[PDB]
Design a protein around this ligand. Structure first.
Ligand SMILES: *[C@@H]1O[C@H](CO)[C@@H](O)[C@H](O)[C@H]1NC(C)=O
Ligand SMILES: *[C@@H]1O[C@H](CO)[C@@H](O)[C@H](O)[C@H]1NC(C)=O
Ligand SMILES: *[C@@H]1O[C@H](CO)[C@@H](O)[C@H](O)[C@H]1NC(C)=O
Lengths: 43, 48
């Protein structure tokens, strides 16, 4: 089973504080609206 | 520990002795223009 990841999976590529800017970076990110497997923990 | 500006320069640092954030503001500067009559008349000048 898969669900909609929406906009999850973005993390800070480094340890520099940045603010009020649009930054283009290439790194290992979760594709937006990609399928992520939905797991259960019952029974 | 460090912040950066659009130009990639440092905007602020955390003081390693006291954990506070300090801004760095470049010291006041500006152009200087000289208004002068020709040296064929007088050597007195004014500074703008
Ligand atoms: C997710 O899976 C659905 C059906 O399982 C499919 O229609 C859709 O194209 C998939 N999306 C992605 C981003 O893989
Ligand atoms: C020395 O470093 C310690 C460690 O954080 C700090 O508590 C203290 O303020 C520092 N000493 C001075 C004089 O800043
Ligand atoms: C220089 O000064 C002389 C006399 O003071 C004057 O006759 C001459 O026209 C001047 N030349 C210029 C270029 O100002």
């Amino acid at each position: 089973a898969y669900t909609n990841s929406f906009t999850r999976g973005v993390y800070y590529p480094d340890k520099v504080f940045r603010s009020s800017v649009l930054h283009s970076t290439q790194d290992l990110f979760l594709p937006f609206f990609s399928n992520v497997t939905w797991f259960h923990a019952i029974h | 520990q460090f912040g950066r500006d659009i130009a990639d320069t440092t905007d602020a640092v955390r003081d390693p002795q006291t954990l506070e954030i300090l801004d760095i503001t470049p010291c006041s500067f500006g152009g200087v223009s000289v208004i002068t009559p020709g040296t064929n008349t007088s050597n007195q000048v004014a500074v703008l």
